[PDB]
Write a protein that binds this ligand. Structure first.
Ligand SMILES: Cc1cc(Cl)c(-c2cc(C(=O)O)c3[nH]cnc3c2)cc1F
Ligand SMILES: [Zn+2]
Length: 343
């Protein structure tokens, strides 16, 4: 039952001290690269974007994966939507800006900026090579710790129209809160071909996770302890284990913590009351997350949390057989009392 899930979470709590030291190994490399990129004309206004829990600047995507986001303040920015994709945009300017070396008429080239960014990193990684670190931009600190670095364009302007019906937290976190979060900046990340940038809102996650209840006092006292974070921790861990178990057959390579997070938060909108997340119902709640995620896998529909018209589970992004492989693996883990959590 819930007892089994609790022992998994307690096991995960002890490995938190090893990924706090690993977060430090990542922070040293990132601070070294930041003062290196800041001396450059193009990356003069480069800064670190705080997205997670460790130092705020470092995030976690898998047992050894780390996510770092380098922001770049881009004032006087005009966005042009690409072929009604709702998430992808061309970057255009409204004077003598430092970003001028990557322009092609009016369109700011993503590949041209990511080339200079990647080269400076590849250059200082060989400079301070007395700390084992090798190669959007992925590094590997001491044959174990993997770190994915992302160059983001910060826009302090209002969120584009595609987001209007996104962040449906009004009935959970409130309308007052949605308005305040929508006052925060948004980020543009190069696309994974065209010179387009994708809307990123990863920085908003830390805001909601540390203030996740309908009640302001959620998880501040024993009498109001919910199982929201625990369901996300268990949903994330389930995929990490499945990805490790089938790293041999490549079908789970496209699926990430991002898909697990999106689906979990959609269940938060679905279940806005803290009573729908009681700590005694850990098993029941985790299953509702598993069921919605399996419904997403089967229907080939997982909506971006900030852009409803953008499908993360589109045939274009992830193939149907990759989705059916995860559907049958999870369905099995559900029908075998989760043996991937065996200890
Ligand atoms: C409630 C909520 C839910 C989600 Cl899913 C995200 C979020 C968004 C992006 C993004 O690119 O837009 C992510 N990219 C990597 N992890 C990400 C997490 C932020 C939130 F505030
Ligand atoms: Zn809570």
């Amino acid at each position: 039952g819930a007892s089994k899930l609790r022992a998994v979470l307690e096991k995960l709590k002890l490995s938190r001290d090893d990924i706090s030291t690993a977060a430090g190994m990542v922070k040293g490399v990132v601070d070294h690269l930041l003062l290196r990129l800041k001396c450059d004309s193009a990356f003069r206004g480069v800064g670190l974007l705080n997205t997670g829990s460790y130092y705020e600047h470092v995030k976690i995507s898998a047992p050894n994966e780390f996510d770092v986001m380098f922001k770049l303040e881009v004032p006087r920015i005009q966005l042009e939507e690409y072929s009604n994709t709702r998430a992808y945009y061309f970057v255009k300017f409204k004077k003598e800006n430092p970003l001028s070396q990557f322009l092609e008429g009016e369109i700011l080239s993503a590949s041209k900026m990511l080339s200079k960014f990647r080269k400076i990193i590849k250059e200082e990684i060989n400079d301070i090579k007395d700390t084992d670190v090798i190669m959007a931009v992925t590094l590997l600190i001491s044959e174990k710790i993997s770190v994915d670095i992302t160059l983001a364009l910060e826009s302090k302007s209002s969120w584009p129209a595609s987001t209007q019906e996104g962040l449906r937290i009004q009935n959970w976190l409130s309308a007052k809160v949605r308005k305040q979060l929508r006052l925060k900046p948004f980020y543009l990340v190069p696309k994974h071909q065209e010179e387009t940038w994708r809307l990123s809102f990863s920085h908003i996650e830390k805001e909601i996770l540390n203030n996740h209840g309908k009640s302001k006092t959620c998880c501040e006292n024993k009498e109001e302890k919910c199982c929201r974070k625990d369901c996300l921790k268990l949903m994330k861990y389930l995929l990490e284990q499945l990805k490790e178990r089938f790293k041999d057959k490549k079908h789970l390579d496209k699926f990430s913590s991002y898909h697990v997070k999106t689906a979990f938060f959609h269940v938060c909108t679905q279940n806005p009351q803290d009573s729908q997340w009681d700590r005694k119902d850990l098993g029941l709640c985790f299953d509702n997350c598993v069921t919605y995620f399996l419904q997403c896998l089967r229907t080939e529909k997982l909506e971006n949390y900030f852009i409803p018209e953008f499908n993360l589970f589109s045939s274009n992004l992830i193939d149907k057989r990759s989705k059916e492989f995860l559907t049958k693996q999870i369905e099995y883990e559900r029908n075998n009392e989760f043996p991937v959590f065996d200890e």
